[PDB]
A paper describes a structure:
The phosphorylated Ser33 and Ser37 in β-catenin are part of the phosphodegron sequence (DpSGφXpS) that binds to the F-box-containing E3 ubiquitin ligase protein β-TrCP, leading to β-catenin ubiquitylation by the SCFβ-TrCP cullin-RING ligase and subsequent degradation by the 26S proteasome. While disruption of β-catenin phosphorylation frequently accounts for elevated protein levels, mutations in β-TrCP are rarely observed. These β-catenin phosphodegron mutations including Ser33 and Ser37, impair the ability of β-catenin to effectively bind to β-TrCP leading to its stabilization and thereby facilitating an enhanced oncogenic transcriptional program. In this study, we report the prospective identification and rational structure-guided optimization of potent molecular glue-like small molecules intentionally designed to enhance the PPI between mutant β-catenin and β-TrCP that potentiate cellular degradation of an engineered mutant β-catenin in a cellular system. To characterize the interaction of mutant β-catenin with the ubiquitin ligase β-TrCP, we developed a fluorescence polarization (FP)-based binding assay utilizing β-catenin phosphodegron peptides (residues 17–48) and recombinant β-TrCP/Skp1 complex (referred as β-TrCP subsequently).
Further optimization of the phenoxy substituent gave diarylthioether derivatives NRX-103094 (4) and NRX-103095 (5) with significant improvements in potency (EC50 = 457 ± 23 nM for NRX-103094) with pSer33/Ser37 β-catenin peptide. Additionally, these molecules broadly enhanced the peptide binding of all the prevalent Ser37 mutations, including phenylalanine, cysteine, and alanine. With pSer33/S37A β-catenin, NRX-103094 gives an EC50 of 62 ± 3 nM and displays a 1000-fold cooperativity of peptide binding to β-TrCP. Importantly, NRX-103094 potentiates the ubiquitylation of pSer33/S37A β-catenin peptide to levels greater than WT pSer33/pSer37 levels at 250 nM. In this system, NRX-103094 enhances the S33E/S37A phosphomimetic peptide binding affinity for β-TrCP from >5 μM in the absence of compound to 22 nM in the presence of 40 μM compound, which is similar to the binding enhancement observed for pSer33/S37A peptide. However, in the presence of 20 μM NRX-103094, robust time-dependent ubiquitylation of S33E/S37A β-catenin peptide is observed. Likewise, the full-length S33E/S37A β-catenin protein is strongly ubiquitylated in the presence of 20 μM NRX-103094, with the ubiquitylation levels approaching that of WT full-length β-catenin protein.
Numbering used by the authors:
A (entry chain C): 29 to 38
B (entry chain A): 138 to 217, 227 to 548
C (entry chain B): 2 to 60, 67 to 139
């Protein structure tokens, strides 16, 4: 899921 | 004292025609038609006063839809040709609006597709557009400027050492935030790099700026508030801390700064003082996207829902269900919400209906638009079109005018 | 300070300088012509008192709507005074009031509101009607 550098959580 | 008085006849009789014209300028179209048929002198006042021209001009001044059509259709050239020309034009404009509104409701559009032709790391994380250009930020570390009309690439800006995650521009500067944890400032005309802000400890995920101030936010869980005296003179005013995970998006106006985070919350801050105001709770997973204007906050979440909020009391006014994956970008105007999801789909929502608690939920999603083959990262829209970009390395222009 | 206004009748009103100067016209006569008192040949005492009352209160709300519950002849005189004195605020609410009496009505209902005779020929009316 980290293949999206634009958003993050945790 | 006379009981009754024909204002519209009496005023021109005394050499005060403009007062009579000003009274009639307040009429809506249908009442202006009625006024025309009251009597010959009323007709003459409306006709010699060019009231239909003034009515179209008042619409262009007060309604971006009418303004956009004046430019796109070319009849705006005649504004600011006899009175009868504008009277005959007015119903054509109405019909034009109706067909545009119908195209939205029914999903009828033309489509332009830019292939960004990224050599290695594909995808377009962010974008902003005007009538001249599309400015786009890419996972290959560059900013590409596209000609809005010819769809050709007019400029590539290099300098970031990671993905360009967020961007905004105005008449003077482009400001970009990057996975390389920096904010950069570029000249919108020449592309020359003018400034670099070293501050955040992790990827800069979002930024907004306006009227001499900027807000930035980061995977490092902080928000930075900046004062911009000029492209080259930018000072840190305050750091806002309190989020327990990455801050994915920030928006603001003169009342409030609004931030949202992987920690499942929206936080509201006082723009003047930078003091915490309140937390908006309710999403069941992290928040991926947000826009804030007036009193309305609209947020999109990993929980696959959209929420509408009043900024003053923090109440959630409406939950929008229907997306089948993470809601990754969202915008709204006066009529619609437009949202994009991880499954490549874009949805159009009826914002008025959504803000009316009588309306049932199933009537709220107006259309689903399926033309991307990857996650939708960013979109912007107006009365006539949507511009969207995706992990699939394309930018789409969805045009509802024809 | 107070300045005396002199109505077309001759009745003189003492008015505070800051109330008076909402009329640019009266302001010009004070500041540029240095006139005292200020003659107003186009405004009689009855309308002038109505105008002074409106200007003090405002040093289109609900109070103005109640203030404008007068016959059309008086509203017409008020429009003229507001024009002559160039009190844009008063001119706007009175003009908006007339527009509100026009909007949402058929031509026949407008005529009846203002006591206006329909003077179109049948041919002329049909033509005007065809063009809507
Ligand atoms: O404890 C629970 O009940 C539970 C159980 C399963 C899942 C979750 N939630 C999430 O996995 C999640 C992710 S994942 C992710 C990441 Cl980290 C990076 C890039 C892309 C993605 Cl999709 C991202 C966000 C956002 F804030 F970014 F939007 N929010 C979230 O909630 C919670
Ligand atoms: Cl997680």
């Amino acid at each position: 899921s980290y293949l999206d550098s634009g958003i993050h959580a945790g | 004292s006379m009981l009754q008085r024909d204002f519209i006849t009496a005023l021109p009789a005394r050499g005060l025609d403009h007062i009579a014209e000003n009274i009639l300028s307040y009429l809506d179209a249908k009442s202006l038609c009625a006024a025309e048929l009251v009597c010959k002198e009323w007709y003459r006042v409306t006709s010699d006063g060019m009231l239909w021209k003034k009515l179209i001009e008042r619409m262009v001044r007060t309604d971006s839809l009418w303004r956009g059509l004046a430019e796109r259709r070319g009849w705006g050239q005649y504004l600011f040709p006899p009175n009868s020309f504008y009277r005959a034009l007015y119903p054509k404009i109405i019909q034009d609006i109706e067909t545009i509104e119908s195209n939205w409701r029914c999903g009828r559009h033309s489509l332009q597709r830019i292939h960004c032709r990224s050599e290695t790391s594909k995808g377009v994380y962010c974008l902003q557009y005007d009538d001249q250009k599309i400015v786009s930020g890419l996972r290959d570390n560059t900013i590409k400027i596209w000609d809005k009309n010819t769809l050709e690439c007019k400029r590539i800006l290099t300098g970031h050492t990671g993905s360009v995650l967020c961007l905004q521009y105005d008449e003077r500067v482009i400001i970009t935030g990057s996975s390389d944890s920096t904010v950069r400032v570029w000249d919108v005309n020449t592309g020359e790099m003018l400034n670099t802000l070293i501050h955040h400890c992790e990827a800069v995920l979002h930024l907004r700026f306006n009227n001499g101030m900027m807000v930035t936010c980061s995977k490092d869980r902080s928000i930075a508030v900046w004062d911009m005296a000029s492209p080259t003179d930018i000072t840190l005013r305050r750091v806002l801390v309190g989020h327990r995970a990455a801050v994915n998006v920030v928006d603001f106006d003169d009342k409030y700064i609004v931030s949202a985070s992987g920690d499942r919350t929206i936080k509201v801050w006082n723009t003047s003082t930078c003091e915490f105001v309140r937390t908006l709770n309710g999403h069941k997973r992290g928040i991926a996207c947000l826009q804030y204007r007036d009193r309305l906050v609209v947020s999109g979440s990993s929980d696959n829902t959209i929420r509408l909020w009043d900024i003053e009391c923090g109440a959630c006014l409406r939950v929008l269900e229907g997306h089948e994956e993470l809601v990754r970008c969202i915008r709204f105007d006066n009529k619609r919400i437009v949202s994009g999801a991880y499954d490549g789909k874009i949805k159009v929502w009826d914002l008025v209906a959504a803000l009316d608690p009588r309306a049932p939920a199933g009537t709220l999603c107006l259309r689903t638009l399926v033309e991307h083959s990857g996650r939708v990262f960013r979109l912007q829209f107006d009365e006539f079109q949507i511009v969207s970009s995706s992990h699939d390395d394309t930018i789409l222009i969805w045009d509802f005018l024809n | 300070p107070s300045i005396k206004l002199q109505s077309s009748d001759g009745e003189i009103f003492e008015v505070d300088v800051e109330i008076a100067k909402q009329s640019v016209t009266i302001k010009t006569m004070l500041e540029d012509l240095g006139m005292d008192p200020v003659p107003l040949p186009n405004v009689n005492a009855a309308i002038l008192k109505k105008v002074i009352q409106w200007c003090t209160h405002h040093k289109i709300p609900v109070w103005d709507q109640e203030f404008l519950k007068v016959d059309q002849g008086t509203l017409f005189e008020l429009i003229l005074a507001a024009n002559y004195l160039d009190i844009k605020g008063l001119l706007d609410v009175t003009c908006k009031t007339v527009a509100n009496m026009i909007k949402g009505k058929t031509p026949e209902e407008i005529r009846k509101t203002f006591n206006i005779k329909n003077d179109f020929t049948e041919e002329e009316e049909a033509q005007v009607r065809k063009e809507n």
